[PDB]
Design a protein around this ligand. Structure first.
Ligand SMILES: *[C@@H]1O[C@H](CO)[C@@H](O)[C@H](O)[C@H]1NC(C)=O
Ligand SMILES: [Cl-]
Ligand SMILES: [Cu+2]
Ligand SMILES: [Cu+2]
Ligand SMILES: [Cu+2]
Ligand SMILES: [Cu+2]
Ligand SMILES: [Mg+2]
Ligand SMILES: [Mg+2]
Ligand SMILES: [Mg+2]
Ligand SMILES: [Mg+2]
Ligand SMILES: [O]
Ligand SMILES: [O]
Ligand SMILES: [O]
Ligand SMILES: [O]
Lengths: 650, 650
């Protein structure tokens, strides 16, 4: 009943053809006859959350079905979180399943999908379930309008087909050169799943604390920004500028994408000034909020609601800044510091209709599914990144004694295999996006996208352990630019904030000289492509129908940079980069988190499900402080960088 | 085979399901086996137009099927006109039908529909045919995207339905108050049909001259502008401003409409400056063109290609100005005067993507089907109207002796019946917008729109004829504002350019005192709603089946203000207007024609099919010259105005 096979099948069924009433008789029967309030002993709160939601439902206060949904819309988010709160209180699976089935048929589908995903992720009852990829559950949020139109035509004509996705804009638009980054369906899943794992609305009263969430918020977005700039460099473009509230947003955007319900996503013209957005904020409010955050950074303390100071000149300072900048419910003082980043998403998202005169739906910036499609995403997030950077730059540069792992030398760094990127093809189903007739048969309708990929390779890191015993070590691997787009050689201080994280792992180094081997496929920064909805249905159905146990444990989380995007595209002619390796004291770094324990496949930016973050060092260590004197790093034996070449095969 | 029944049936079939290969086996056979080059005696040009078009087709130089079409696109227009030129040379119906069937399957559907319409209108072979309403042949061009999506959903689910249309924008957008004017499907048919009847590309080598076309171009757009402003006054709004190339376009527009192929129509933000449009014109080019036209007006002559003067200080001057402003192929000097109005349509239409960076399709301003949906249409056309007005204002005011119809006195003007407007509901089919499969039964899919309408009324004009014999008189009826939106009473000079034409008719006035009656239904300014495609199919099919002479001589042209929009909306509280009646010398006005003959039902602005324009007076007579001294008009017995009240019933 609560076996993995049945829970997976239940989730598959709940998410199937999400825009129509359920076609599964058992779910129909539950939605008709189950009473969320019939037996409140099924809830750890004795029904408090179910009472809240049922009262909103019965008073007709919930968003209707067949309507756009945005997580950044306060009331719509509150409604989705009402359902999450019910699911989160369920003691046993039948409560979770029955409430999901009941509210699927009552609530807006966007709210429902969101609540069910975060309910699965944050309830112990969801352990072992593999969530289908959102690009097959709500394909409109991941597929351009032209391809959706071809899917609608296939359905109108009752003919199967597979349709090729191209990028938006034209070759005249130089920004299209890097569309493969922000439009990649896996990169978008990475982004929404990170926020599902680490939601800004999280309150620890829901069950557990999300360790170092505010610092992970800084880090994951710093890495998105740095990775995008690496693609720009690969394509003869300059780095993104930062946004500013008093300066023009140079690069506009035409999504050429549509909601299933709500119309086409709005366009933003080139070279527009920010306008006040009715019901959201004035541009001036954003500037004041920014000023208040910088006041805290430059003071070295955050001001509490009663005026007392909260020291941020300590390792948790960056985390507390993440709390107040995002902002999350961990913010000590949202009345004063507001919500710079989340409000900025909405401010930018609404610039195509800032006063609501045109009845346009929210912009792509107002969904984590779609935000990175928009060039301005990266200008906004570089702007935010620079706020964090003023804090991280305020600390003293590391010294030799800070950085040295005594008796541990990196003798050599090499790669087995060529660093080669290419584009290949990937398919996903559009069936959930089309409308099914009563008693007419489905037909297969697929999208085919070109996605970046790379060949497998292996790091060979030769280390000498001259301590009298084997020692746990953390291997930290970054890719750093050597020259900018003007051919100017970068100093280490000018490169460090541009480096992208490639790996982090903990491994015992035996005494003597040994070469550590690490496969690119095992990176703690990346996760594989998601299994298809069809595959999850097939596996769950086969297990349930045969009475077999379903073991999906080999599947990884959906949070993490796609494996295929580990490396920047680079150029056909080749580009050289610095491969930076820091080997640090693993006993110190993992103290309290065990260096033998399993930390999963995505701990670098996505942490460890249900556990504390396993690396005590500041995110970005040892590159997160100013390095004005390269001699300091060059004198540390446990740090080494080497030149590598990446070639794109067109 | 040349009977009206069969010709109508043939046209109905050619226009059915226009986005798909023809489903009529007889048209299929023609398209496969007919040779446009197979009998030059079919054509009045010995086959030349057919050779020209076949060479473009055989060289693969024609626009592909399933692609947007804009009449303002030079090459696409040239291709459509190549097919028009063939149809126009056919001597007999089978040539016309067979070429249309042949090229339907070879040419872009937008080009084909355009060419077939103008071919029917401008060939004697088209006499008696009633063209289906374009809003049922290409419903995307008349139906917002939300309703189209519901139609697509109805087809995907194989379920018939009727869906309600409910105007673009929000109530926060004051411009939405008057959306019922420019978005009315019949107003859009009026506009496209006027341009089909009087095309700017016309050359008299096609067979006949279009009498007074350049002046009718001024007048029909002056009346569109003046009618729109009457709706604004009815809705507590100020008049539209005029466009200026160096000033902001205040009112943006979100069409919320889509092409069948080509994507969503582009949005224009509020408060934008004009930008240069790559491949079209620089904004400065528009200013220079405007300056050159005003140079001609203020010189009193147009400058020919060799520099000699073309006098415009004469009644034809306004027509020659229309020729050079539109501009049409009647322009004596397009190298110098350019094409201000047509280029302006494209400049405005492309302001959502002026450099083509985002690959957006042409704007609503780039089709006569859609142009009036855009608020900026009326700002552009008031701007153009003011150019014409500098010319019309340059002439001396009329004198008593100019205006008096001696022995003819208007004793009284009254209306039988209250002047009442309201909104009612109107339905049209969306079937041609959806995709039909192979062997898939149609389901009925309709759109329902709310449209302005009014109650029937009758003019009672009491006239005393003391000439001594019966005399032909022209009755000219205008509706004029009494006060502006600020409650300021307008002088006659300030009213005259705001007056809207309600009627013009020729009638013998007997000796003595008599009351002329004229039904609102018989206005020469208006035409009824088009018969539906379904009704035309039924009537053609019923006539063909059973050997019954189809005669549709009961229907009118599609050029003309819709009868339902004869009156401005007005207010629920009522508004008072001046009803202005000028009775003028019908002998003088129709000299060189036939005054008491059938002029059709739409001669005021749409002329008479295949005949000279029946009224020799300047368009707008007697209101088209300055009236600085109202005493002149008050002293003329054959002019009278009276106050009438129009009430809106909500
Ligand atoms: C559409 O309009 C008709 C008549 O105005 C009405 O009866 C019907 O309920 C409307 N449908 C919707 C969905 O509003
Ligand atoms: Cl009488
Ligand atoms: Cu994010
Ligand atoms: Cu963000
Ligand atoms: Cu026009
Ligand atoms: Cu025009
Ligand atoms: Mg991994
Ligand atoms: Mg050193
Ligand atoms: Mg075809
Ligand atoms: Mg020009
Ligand atoms: O984000
Ligand atoms: O975010
Ligand atoms: O127009
Ligand atoms: O026009």
């Amino acid at each position: 009943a609560s076996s993995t096979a049945h829970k997976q099948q239940d989730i598959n069924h709940l998410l199937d053809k999400i825009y129509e009433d359920t076609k599964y008789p058992d779910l129909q029967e539950i939605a008709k006859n189950f009473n969320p309030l019939g037996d409140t002993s099924m809830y750890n709160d004795q029904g408090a959350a179910a009472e809240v939601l049922m009262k909103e439902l019965n008073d007709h206060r919930l968003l209707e079905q067949h309507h756009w949904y945005s997580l950044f819309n306060a009331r719509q988010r509150e409604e989705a979180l009402m359902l999450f709160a019910v699911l989160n209180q369920c003691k046993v699976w039948h409560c979770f399943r029955n409430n999901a089935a009941y509210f699927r048929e009552q609530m807006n589908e966007g709210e429902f999908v969101y609540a069910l995903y975060v309910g699965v992720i944050h309830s112990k009852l969801g352990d072992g379930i593999v969530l289908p990829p959102l690009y097959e559950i709500t394909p409109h949020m991941f597929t351009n309008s032209e391809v959706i139109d071809k899917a609608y035509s296939a359905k109108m004509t009752q003919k199967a087909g597979t349709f090729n996705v191209s990028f938006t804009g034209t070759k005249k638009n130089k920004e299209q050169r890097v569309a493969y980054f922000g439009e990649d369906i896996g990169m978008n899943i990475h982004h929404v799943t990170w926020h599902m794992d680490f939601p800004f609305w999280w309150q620890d009263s829901y069950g557990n604390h999300l360790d170092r969430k505010g610092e992970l918020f800084f880090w994951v977005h710093h890495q998105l920004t740095a990775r995008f700039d690496f693609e720009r460099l690969s394509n003869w473009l300059d780095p993104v500028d930062e946004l500013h509230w008093d300066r023009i947003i140079r690069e506009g955007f035409a999504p050429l994408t549509s909601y299933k319900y709500g119309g086409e996503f709005p366009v933003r013209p080139d070279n527009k000034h920010f306008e006040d957005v009715d019901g959201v904020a004035h541009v001036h409010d954003m500037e004041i909020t920014e000023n208040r955050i910088y006041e805290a950074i430059d003071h070295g303390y955050i001001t509490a609601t009663d005026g007392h100071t909260i020291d941020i000149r300590q390792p948790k300072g960056i985390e507390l800044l993440g709390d107040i900048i995002e902002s999350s419910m961990y913010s000590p003082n949202a009345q004063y510091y507001g919500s710079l980043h989340n409000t900025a998403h909405v401010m930018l998202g609404r610039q195509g209709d800032p006063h609501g005169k045109f009845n346009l739906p929210p912009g792509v910036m107002e969904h984590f599914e779609t935000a990175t499609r928009d060039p301005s995403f990266f200008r906004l997030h570089k702007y935010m990144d620079n706020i964090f950077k003023k804090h991280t730059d305020s600390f003293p540069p590391y010294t030799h004694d800070d950085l040295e792992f005594a008796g541990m030398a990196v003798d050599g760094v090499a790669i087995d295999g060529e660093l080669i990127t290419f584009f290949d093809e990937f398919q996903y189903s559009l069936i959930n996006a089309v409308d099914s007739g009563e008693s007419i048969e489905d037909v297969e309708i697929n999208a085919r996208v070109h996605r970046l990929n790379h060949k497998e390779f292996t790091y060979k890191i030769t280390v000498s352990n001259s301590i009298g015993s084997d020692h746990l070590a953390t291997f930290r691997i970054f890719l750093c630019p050597i020259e900018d787009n003007n051919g100017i050689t970068l100093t280490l201080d000018k490169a460090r904030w541009l480096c992208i994280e490639l790996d982090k792992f903990f491994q015992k180094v035996p005494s003597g000289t040994h070469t550590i081997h690490r496969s690119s496929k095992d990176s703690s920064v990346t996760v594989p492509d998601m299994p298809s909805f069809h595959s999850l249905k097939e596996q769950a159905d086969n297990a349930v129908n045969g009475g077999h146990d379903l073991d999906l444990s080999a599947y990884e989380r959906s949070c993490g940079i796609p494996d295929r995007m580990l490396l920047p595209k680079s150029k056909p002619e080749g580009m050289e980069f610095n491969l930076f390796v820091a080997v640090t004291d693993g006993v110190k770094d993992t103290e309290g988190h065990n260096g033998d324990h399993d930390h999963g496949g995505t701990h670098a930016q996505c942490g460890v499900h249900g556990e504390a973050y396993p690396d005590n060092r500041p995110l970005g260590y040892p590159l997160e402080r100013r390095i004005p004197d390269e001699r300091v790093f060059d004198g540390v034996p446990n740090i080494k960088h080497v030149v590598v070449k990446i070639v794109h095969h067109p």
